[PDB]
Symmetry: D2
Subunit: 386 residues, 4 copies
């Protein structure tokens, strides 16, 4: 029942199932996982692929020969399992050198080092077949007002992404970039804090067609925002290149619960939207099995991510296919929302006396929207109570 297959395109970061359970107040509760073992275990669960930061796969400061060894072992596990690598990213946050940022660090020599470390891993991602390269600027930001001039930092952020775009085009690489927003943590405030800020910034890059967003359920919810609404705006702009799925219980620290935990109805409306819109990218889980769990709990949590997606997919499809729901959607005038307000044009609107002079505002005000009956049909569908 609800069993994933690789055609469901479920992917996981190496850092997710491999999180050792170090949090700000506590030591690791689990041993390190060898990436090869994660690939094999995830393949057995029905995953389609894995993702990585450079430093997940190649220990920081590895020699060039150790580096090849690590990559070759990893390549063999991908070949043995059929697993793909659709996304890769750079760790620009763990090492102390990045304590004030990578691309927007105040120290210029750190910024140059951040760019070189990124470019090296873009080459590796292309060689492994990644289509999307994610940037999460977790250290770009500030705890205090005077520490970061945000206009200068946005100049430096645009400089860095423009150079990366020049690099991939000059190499002929078929890879796109996706910015992963997060509003805070580990910095007091992070630059480009939401999907909207990231989309707006992309429009000022030299080659905006190369850049999209990689939104994460829990991150938008850390600002109290509606995640399906943000995703709909990203889809509307043609910029949903990738997505991070997980769970979050409101405005607090980044929990990274398994997908379906946290705000369950928001998960339902997210799956409805992704499936209706024909999103065809990876269904990626950026999640942390809680540090209460041993390795059996890690794999149960990973399996639950995909199970919950597949249950919600079924319930959302049943909802949209239900004749009674389709009648309710017309009762609530969703059909009218999809029609142009004024395809007849400005001048026709200005001369149309039924739009103002003879508009019966009181009759229009009296029409109920029937949204509550519609929402309870959606609840009944989610719960399998019809």
């Amino acid at each position: 029942n609800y069993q994933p297959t690789p055609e469901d395109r479920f992917t996981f970061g190496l850092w997710t199932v491999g999180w050792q359970g170090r949090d700000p107040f506590g030591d690791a509760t689990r041993r390190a996982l060898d990436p090869v073992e994660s690939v094999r275990r995830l393949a057995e669960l029905g995953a389609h692929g894995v993702t990585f930061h450079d430093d997940d796969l190649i220990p920081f400061g590895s020699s060039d020969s150790e580096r090849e060894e690590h990559v070759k072992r990893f390549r063999q596990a991908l070949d043995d399992t059929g697993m793909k690598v659709p996304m890769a990213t750079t760790n620009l946050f763990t090492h102390p050198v990045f304590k004030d940022g990578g691309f927007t660090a105040n120290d210029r020599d750190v910024r140059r080092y951040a760019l070189r470390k990124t470019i090296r891993n873009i080459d590796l991602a292309v060689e492994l077949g990644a289509e999307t390269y994610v940037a999460w600027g977790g250290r770009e930001g500030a705890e205090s007002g005077g520490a970061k001039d945000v206009r200068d930092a946005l100049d430096r952020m645009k400089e860095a992404f423009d150079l990366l775009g020049e690099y991939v085009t000059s190499q002929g690489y078929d890879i796109r970039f996706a910015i992963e927003p997060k509003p805070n943590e580990p910095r007091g405030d992070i630059l480009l804090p939401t999907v909207g800020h990231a989309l707006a910034f992309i429009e000022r890059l030299e080659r905006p067609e190369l850049y999209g967003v990689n939104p994460e359920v829990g991150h938008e919810q850390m600002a109290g925002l509606n995640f399906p609404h943000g995703i709909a705006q990203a889809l509307w702009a043609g910029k949903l290149f990738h997505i991070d799925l997980n769970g979050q219980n409101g405005i607090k620290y980044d929990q990274d619960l398994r997908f379906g935990a946290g705000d369950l109805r928001a998960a339902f409306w997210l799956v409805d939207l992704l499936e209706s819109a024909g999103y065809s990218g990876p269904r990626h889980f950026d999640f942390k099995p809680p540090r209460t769990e041993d390795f059996d709990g890690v794999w149960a949590s990973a399996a639950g991510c995909m199970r919950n997606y597949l249950i919600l997919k079924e319930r959302a499809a049943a909802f949209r296919a239900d004749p009674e729901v389709q009648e309710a959607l017309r009762a609530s005038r969703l059909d009218e929302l999809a029609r142009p307000t004024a395809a007849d044009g400005l001048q026709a609107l200005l001369d149309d006396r039924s739009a103002f002079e003879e508009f019966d505002v009181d009759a229009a005000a009296a029409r109920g929207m029937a949204f509550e009956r519609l929402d309870q049909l959606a609840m009944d569908h989610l719960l399998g109570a019809r």
Copy 2:
């Protein structure tokens, strides 16, 4: 001491000092103010101008002759006082007809009526000399997931703003539009919920140069966002057309406290930024004198808005002029943040062995950023403790 003059460009909405104190749980505590009396009282306090919704100035459903009478009375008070009207906006939220929105209402005939009501007031704003026309889509949004297809709604929102842009260009009007974001309240979630979402949406309009943002302190803070950071991004994009100043205590209902209340250090960093960047638009207060107050309290609260701006302006100027602060900014490498990361270009960066192969990451990691000493110099300046 700290006395405003009209050259400080302080402005107030008629609805601010005129708020009667009706909240969701309580009746009005103050009588209605005649707009003429507000103009005179605000002029005496040192205000530069006032703003209005159509329905603040002309009671909803007024006949064409009553309408002229109301406008003429208002015009006379502006002439008697020297007060300007730099901004106007449309009430598309109070009347029951707008219960599901104006521009993105599901009912098409409401959307057409919303546009006609807006166009009528644009003509009036131009006649009164307004430079900026604000749109706050307070009813555009939803309480439940199925009620609003957000892609269709964004289509309708873009349709509405494109028609308004076609209207002002066809009339030859020298007016620009500013979208005022708000994340929630009165709708469960509002479309374009933050400065970032609004900036991103503007880039998809037919004539993006006509549209900017009118951010409000308290609204970004209702999503827990850093308001000076958002304003810096708006300035960076060239889109800060107008600003709403007030106070808010965190993530809760929209409080609209007087400016300087709420997050006081954020107010300090906001004034520092506006003054450093040479923002030359109106300093507009979108605030509500608490319903505990009588009319003497209303004017004390209005006066406090401008007093707090002028005190913070002095402290921010003293901060930036202090030699010890300028030395601290260099100690924290804000000068280096302003320098290009790689003006030498991509190829030079790729060949620069000091950027990677011979970069001493450990020496760079060991450098403190000296941000705490800088922040305490900013605290001492704010408090007048130096």
Copy 3:
């Protein structure tokens, strides 16, 4: 399917289905409901009873004869339908006189008036058979720090509740009090903001056995708190006298959505707890049908409150009855949580070398808690996916 009967003890406030849809930004969208019509409509839906504020039932400032007329009409509808009145409360928030509070208003004469208005309605509630008298101190609090000395206000709050307790005991009334906490709105901060603060305050009253709490789902969630956890603490103290059920989407204005909307998994864990603990008080809905709805939407929303309770009751019962869940609970040592840590006593614990000197902390640390498999069994049960 899932049809309520009066033995389910579902109750509604007159102010809930009768909310006209006035919010801070908008006029009423629905006409006023006659209380008699609400009683009849709710009885047809399967409700067990209704609740009221004094001013819902008797218009403010009614003459003594109008007052009797209103009560007699209401009594007749209760007799015609079989509806009960298990709870009543006082409106100490709508009238302008209460703009700074009722029991903790700075003006002494307002505080005395607040007490007299309350006592009058206690007599009426007893005559209608109410077992619980609720106090929601919505105006008790402040927007600014100097306006309210909170120690003096707590003195005044304790004075008011002590007098009410002296009044009911001197009259021989069999009624108890329940304080309904709320953290903010309409005041910037409200006194006794959470279930915990209210429970702590009760312990300083002269006769604490007379006072309990009436927590509301959405109010605890406006502080980001776990509502089932708070209810468990109230049950643990023996103080859950009444409960308000509704929905809320996180930290924002008080939404009062229908129960089951908002945080659906929290609703599941709440129903599990109430049913497991044998809570036998009313299942009261303090909710507002959204102002998008006409009267048919009002009754659909009311019906959905009880439907969602009954669906969640079934799923929680199925969860606890499942042998596989009972095995998982033992796997996660919930049985051990219920056993005393040290029934052998302090001295035995101090001499027990297996508790410290010879405790194998590393073996104990290695035990997984199996919480994720348990939580996914709870998800499968909630969704009907087993």
Copy 4:
């Protein structure tokens, strides 16, 4: 200017200035500090004393002889500097064995070990002269609903604190306990999440006079609560045994900024209250110098904690001493808030026709509270603008 002396009773935890800068996303940026060096550096800055967890002072798993060595070195530094140790606490959160809690872990043998580890450190704290023993239950809680039966956990929490009270009374120790609440982080929800929940729980302990609260600025603000209001309630109950001072920017991860950062006006109202109430306990800083800082930044941040307290103390004293403020407080009827509502008693209130039958509610409603003029006098005082 604003220089602390040991009579200001400023104290710091060893873990504060000694925080190495490991956060969930990043390695340590600073080396470990020897406790002896912290004591000497803090003494030079004007601190009065230090606090510790057992594991800060004695590395976990130390032999009994290493333990004595560590204590003796520490004792010598206290003797050389005059520094006191007024508070101590237990680390029941770092080691993996505590991943599901100490006192409320599901595993019984962990709970017994938690108690033995605590008792051992109580003996050490008494020997060092500590008056207060703090308990922060950072691991007591849950990420999912089924993992923790909260009634059973509260039984186990009460069992643990009752045993500790029996232990200190049987030994004749003159030490009191203080519970430090926190709503979340590192657990998804923590038990006893606010000052109110902790105060309520204390009233069910066997010997409630032994237990008080140790509230922390940032923790109450992580639930969006008003921290001066919570402290006033703790003072009102006679339970403010200790306090943790720091800064926090709203509802997000626990930032532990230096005191005065975060919500500056809340810091002003906190200092006003502590000084007015004659709080005579330690002014303890539970803060983390940001990981951007080197060791010079650590000591600058520590110094800023005490500087900001002393500046706010001066401004609050000036505020309360100002004749114009004292007149404003009477104008806003704070004098009337301090007077009994009904010292004449219930029967006199019931017969007093001026309290209801002849009360002029409209005249009373018309009185402004003059709270805005009062709040602007407080702003002017805080900023030194008078």
